[PDB]
Amino acid sequence: TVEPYKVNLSQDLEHQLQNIIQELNLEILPPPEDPSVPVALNIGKLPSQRQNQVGVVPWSPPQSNWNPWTSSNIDEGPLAFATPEQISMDLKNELMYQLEQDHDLQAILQERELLPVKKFESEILEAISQNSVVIIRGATGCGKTTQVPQFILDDFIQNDRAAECNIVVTQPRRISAVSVAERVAFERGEEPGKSCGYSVRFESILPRPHASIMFCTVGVLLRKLEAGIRGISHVIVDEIHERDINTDFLLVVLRDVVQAYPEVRIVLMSATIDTSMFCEYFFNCPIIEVYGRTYPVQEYFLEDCIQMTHFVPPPDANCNLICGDEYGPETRLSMSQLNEKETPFELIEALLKYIETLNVPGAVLVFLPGWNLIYTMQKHLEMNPHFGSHRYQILPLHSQIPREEQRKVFDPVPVGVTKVILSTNIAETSITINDVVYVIDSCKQKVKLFTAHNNMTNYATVWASKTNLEQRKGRAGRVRPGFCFHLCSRARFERLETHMTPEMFRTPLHEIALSIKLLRLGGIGQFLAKAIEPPPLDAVIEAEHTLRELDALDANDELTPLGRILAKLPIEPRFGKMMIMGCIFYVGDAICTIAAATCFPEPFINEGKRLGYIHRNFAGNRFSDHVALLSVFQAWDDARMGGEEAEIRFCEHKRLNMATLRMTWEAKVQLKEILINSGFPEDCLLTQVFTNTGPDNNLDVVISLLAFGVYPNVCYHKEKRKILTTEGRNALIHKSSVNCPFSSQDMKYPSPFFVFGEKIRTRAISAKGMTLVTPLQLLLFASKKVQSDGQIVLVDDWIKLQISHEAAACITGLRAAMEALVVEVTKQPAIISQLDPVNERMLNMIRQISRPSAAGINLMI
């Protein structure tokens, strides 16, 4: 229930808009006969592709003249025209001397031989040599991840077959691929570069071309499969029990490879779960069990956690209201006062003080869901002097901090000092800490539930499974009889699911859909039906629909020249098309910069409620987080000119996370590299200088293209922090955003329209990373449906605009004209440098309506 926002654009512009759509051969659809029935201004996009069938990804064993990682030959170098025998012998002789000379490596080998998996080495190597596929089931902390790959390599080194061994290991997470590669490197007295290289998204330290272990993510591997798995002996799919969507999709591919090429060796590695599902899938492959030192863990629940602490809190069916009558009268009362949706931060402090009163030295492992709640818990404790450097050592563990800090969890602490690890679900199965005796469990999980109908990326904190709680408890009993503190009532444990819902059921498939087509694996639905647990129908339909809109797929659901580029780009297909459109407007670098910076957390550091002057000053008068992001990036790139220390002193002074800006940059260069290879010229991807205050037409175009990329994320500002969503529901501007004002203040915007990055609903709807746009930019790129009565126009059944019917039908025309050019450009990206004279004015007219002045707006007020 809002007024129609008027648009005071010049008559000069209206002529120019009408002039070009006439030249483009696009008639304006006339006003309706009566205003009660509106007519849509939406123009349908302006070929018969051959039907695909069943096809398996090809395989070939390791060679002596082939580098499997670079996927090319070895003409130059010492291992160029070497014999398989010369190599295998040299690689052994190299290892023989290293094991005798280095005494600090002998000390490391002596630790490797104590790990439970060691005694099974004989069985594992035998199982793999005989059977194509094998499952290596076993408890977390036995060393199946770190050792099994080495055993397989050493078995080929020591037996003089080292030239016939190249191992691929597929970790589900990003940090796990690096962490393990850096660990397995140290365990051979080397650095990653030599024998144990890695390759994650926008970061890779490739191994040597023979007798090597590549620790990559599944997504990285799938993108490099265009050719096929050429020059690889073993494929170790690690942490299958996590049920990562890409892991599940990979197992569908590998099953086809085992069937057609039974010489290859797959090695699935699972935790203590029901592996019968995977076993059956891979033709009842052997399940090599792995066990060792275990300890009985005395697990407690919220009833017991208030019983032995005498705790009292501050001022579906709620399970805290239920309580055993056997438990104390006050215990039952204290618990019922506590909310279930918020994790009890005060109770955790009381449990750390109970651990003290036992007088049994050991480290504490606190399982929280998000960094937001880990950063919360860390503050709470360090505010209390009792938890000081002399007495306590608190260490945060999540996949978004320096690897230096992630390694400090393993470092033994001074005697008397307690080590409390505020970790995520990373320390559940993927990695094991050795010092842990006591374990506190929130019994919560941070899952990315994406609904398509309203584009809601809800990071909901939902309850964990019985399998989660069972394996979180397991971490306690590795050193001694530990204690596990579950922060959920004995009633709530009953109303938990046996297992978690696999990602395959509750994730979008449009990224996997492209991969299927790119790898020529046939039909999207046809393939995904063969998955160990196929995805829901509606998710496949959604994915297929989502891709046909982008023109990534045709009517026959075959890969278009456009879609092929999107499949080769490791980003959201929509942000992939945005980048291509950037290359046409010669702002490709600026757009690549933005696209990249969505793969890492905002480089801005939090220092209170809202950002200070220094952080806001990057935003300028554009009222855009994305322009602030380019502004810091431009200012940071100039701070690198004066060497490495000048870079750090800038980052320090400006309160920026240097680690991010470098990873964001390295990503941008790789995004550029793929567009170049796809055909796009160098001249449209040059680091063009701009200003975030003065009139800049190139920056106007970047905000326009940005509106395209984030759609359907767009909102209307009413007052203060309150904004209206697409569905017509109220929402809050994120406290992080520059457009967020000070507590109870009036921010005066020259336009109420804002496209944004993430739509989050933790409690209420919060719009993060926002960018101001004009009514013209809204109609052009940030809207699909546009109806008109003659005076008013309706944009996706919300936001009414009192604007000329013609101008609206012209702007909606430019979109369809632009859409058509994207198709023509993707057939041959070279044509960007010499576009049609008619099409060069079409882009100039988009550049025109992109300007603030085009909607009668002046930012310098």
Ligand X SMILES: CCn1nc(C(=O)Nc2cccc(NS(C)(=O)=O)c2)cc1C
Cα 668 to Cα 575: distance, rounded to the nearest angstrom: 13
Q: Which helix or strand (DSSP H or E) is residue 213 part of?
A: strand 212-217
491 makes contact, choosing from ligand X, ligand ADP, Mg ion, none, with CB < 5 to 8 Å by partner type, with none
Q: Does 488 bind ligand X (CB under 6 A)?
A: no
Contact track, ligand ADP, 335-364, x by CB under 6 A: ------------------------------
Q: Name which position in 140, 445, 467, 839 contacts ligand ADP (CB under 6 A).
A: 140
Name which position in 157, 253, 395, 431 contacts ligand ADP (CB under 6 A): 431
Tell me whether residue 224 or residue 610 sits nearer to ligand X (CB atom).
224
d(CA 327, CA 324): 6
Decide: is 432 part of the binding site for ligand ADP (CB under 6 A): yes
239 is in an annotated binding site: yes
Q: How far is the CB of 232 from ligand X (least distance, A)?
A: 5
Could you tell me the CA-to-CA distances from 501 to 18, 245, 411, 464, 525 in Å, in that order? 53, 11, 35, 10, 20
**Contact present, 406 and 183 (Cβ < 8 Å):** no
Q: Is 757 annotated as belonging to a binding site? A: no
Q: Is 172 near ligand ADP (CB under 6 A)? A: no
Please return the burial class of 589, using the count of CB atoms within 10 Å of its CB with bins 0-12, 13-18 and 19+: buried
The closest alpha carbon to 212, from 166, 144, 147, belongs to 166
C-beta of 143: minimal distance to ligand ADP in Å? 4
Q: What residues pair up with 234 in beta bridges, in sequence order?
A: 167, 265
- Residue with the shortest CB distance to ligand ADP: 145
The reply on whether position 216 binds ligand X by CB under 6 A is yes
What mask, x for binding Mg ion by CB under 5 A, covers residues 155 to 194?
----------------------------------------
Q: Does 188 bind ligand ADP (CB under 6 A)?
A: no
146 is in an annotated binding site: yes
The CB-of-244 to ligand ADP minimum distance in angstroms stands at 15
Of 54-62, 138-146, 228-236, 695-703, the segment contacting Mg ion by CB under 5 A is: 138-146
**Is residue 220 near ligand X by the rule CB under 6 A?**
yes
What are φ and ψ of residue 67, in 5° steps? -95, 115
Using CB under 6 A, pick the residue from 18, 146, 400, 853 that binds ligand ADP. 146
- Sole binder of ligand ADP in the list 142, 221, 565, 842 (CB under 6 A): 142
Measured from the CB of residue 339, what is the shortest distance to ligand X in angstroms? 46
766 counts as binding ligand ADP under rule CB under 6 A: no
Position 143 contacts ligand ADP (CB under 6 A): yes
The contacts of residue 138 (CB under 8 Å, 6+ apart) are: 116, 117, 120, 144, 270, 271, 272, 289, 290, 291
Q: DSSP secondary structure string, 763-815?
A: SSEEEEEEEE--HHHHHHTS-S-EEESSSEEEESSS-EEE--HHHHHHHHHHH
Question: Which residues within the stretch 188-207 sit at the binding site for ligand X (CB under 6 A)?
Answer: 199, 204, 206
**What would the 3-class secondary structure string for 2-65 be?**
CCCEECCCCHHHHHHHHHHHHHCCCCCCCCCCCCCCCEECCCCCCCCCCCCCCCCCCEECCCCC
> If you search the block for the tokens 């770190």, which residue do you land on?
146
Read off the tokens for 257. Answer: 């490879």
CA dihedral 454, 460, 465, 469 (to 10 degrees): 170
Do 780 and 849 form a contact (C-beta atoms < 8 A)? Answer: yes
CB of 214 to ligand X, least distance (A): 5
Please, what is the minimum distance in Å from the beta carbon of residue 199 to ligand ADP? 19
> Annotation-wise, does 824 bind a ligand?
no
The answer to whether residue 250 forms part of the interface with ligand X (CB under 6 A) is no
Is 145 marked within a binding site? yes
225 binds, among ligand ADP, Mg ion, ligand X, none (CB under 5 to 8 A by kind): ligand X
Least Cβ distance, residue 209 to ligand X (angstroms) = 11
Q: How many CA atoms lie less than 13 Å away from 683 in the CB half-sphere?
A: 7
- Tell me the window of 141-149, 335-343, 466-474, 799-807 that interacts with ligand ADP (CB under 6 A): 141-149
432 binds, among ligand X, ligand ADP, Mg ion, none (CB under 5 to 8 A by kind): ligand ADP
Among 132, 145, 343, 660, binds Mg ion (CB under 5 A): 145
Residues of this chain, 40-79, that bind Mg ion according to CB under 5 A: none
Selection from Mg ion, ligand X, ligand ADP, none that 68 binds (CB < 5 to 8 A by kind) is: ligand X
Among 115, 308, 541, 820, binds ligand ADP (CB under 6 A): 115
224-257: b or e for each residue (b if 16 or more CB lie within 10 Å)? bbeebbbbbbbbbbbbbbbbbbbbbbbbbbbbbb
Binds ligand X by CB under 6 A, chosen from 24, 142, 229, 587? 229
Shortest Cβ contact with ligand X: which residue?
199
Question: Do 411 and 434 touch, CB atoms closer than 8 A?
Answer: no
- Cβ closest to ligand ADP, residue 187 vs residue 340: 187
Indicate the residue among 145 and 737 with the shorter CB distance to ligand ADP.
145
Interaction with ligand X in 59-78: which residues (CB under 6 A)?
Answer: 68-71
β strands within 606-727, DSSP E: 714-719, 722-724
Task: Kindly state the tokens that stand for 321.
Answer: 């209201």
Beta carbons within 8 Å of 315's beta carbon, 6+ residues apart: none
- Pick one of ligand ADP, Mg ion, ligand X, none as the site partner of residue 159 (Cβ within 5 to 8 A by kind): none
Binding partner selected for residue 70 from ligand ADP, ligand X, Mg ion, none, CB under the kind-specific 5 to 8 Å limit = ligand X
Q: 235 near 265, Cβ under 8 Å?
A: yes
593 is in an annotated binding site: no
| Cα–Cα distances in angstroms (integers) from residue 341 to residues 25, 306, 735, 738, in the given order | 58, 18, 21, 29
CB of 826 to ligand X, least distance (A): 24
CB of 173 to Mg ion, least distance (A): 11
Among 161, 183, 224, 655, binds ligand X (CB under 6 A): 224
Tell me which of Mg ion, ligand ADP, ligand X, none is bound by residue 216, counting a contact when its beta carbon lies within the kind-specific cut-off of 5 to 8 angstroms. ligand X
Per partner kind, with CB cut-offs from 5 to 8 A, the member of ligand ADP, ligand X, Mg ion, none near residue 74 is none
DSSP readout, 85-117? HHHHHHHHHHHHHHHHH-HHHHHHHHHHTTSGG
Question: Is the peptide bond prior to 32 cis by the omega test (within 30 degrees of 0)?
Answer: no
How far apart are the C-alpha atoms of 440 and 443, rounded to whole Å?
9
Among residues 684, 322, 244, which one has the least CA distance to residue 503? 244
Q: Single out the segment in contact with ligand ADP by CB under 6 A; choices: 136-144, 218-226, 344-352, 809-817.
A: 136-144
Q: Report the residue from 24, 87, 153, 221 that binds ligand X according to the rule CB under 6 A.
A: 221
Q: Which residue, 204 or 736, has its beta carbon nearer to ligand X?
A: 204
Q: What are phi and psi of 163, to 5 degrees?
A: -75, -15
CA angle 402, 403, 406 (to 5 degrees): 100
C-alpha torsion angle, residues 66, 72, 77, 83 (rounded to 10): 10
619 is an annotated ligand-binding site residue: no
Convert 455-473 into a string of H (helix), E (strand) and C (coil). CEEEEEEEECCHHHHHHHH
Closest among 651, 578, 858, 853 to 12, alpha carbons compared: 853
Residue 448: enclosing H or E segment and its boundaries?
A: strand 444-451
Binding mask 137-176 for ligand X (x = CB under 6 A): -------------------------------x--------
Ranges within 236-275 binding ligand ADP (CB under 6 A): none
Residue 212: name its binding partner from ligand ADP, ligand X, Mg ion, none (Cβ under 5 to 8 Å by kind). Answer: none
Which residues are annotated as part of the binding site? Answer: 138-146, 239
Annotated binding site for Mn(2+): 145, 239
| Binding-site ranges for ligand ADP (CB under 6 A) | 115, 140-146, 183, 410, 431-432, 434
Name the residues that contact ligand X, by CB under 6 A.
Answer: 68-71, 168, 199, 204, 206, 214, 216, 220-221, 224-225, 229-232
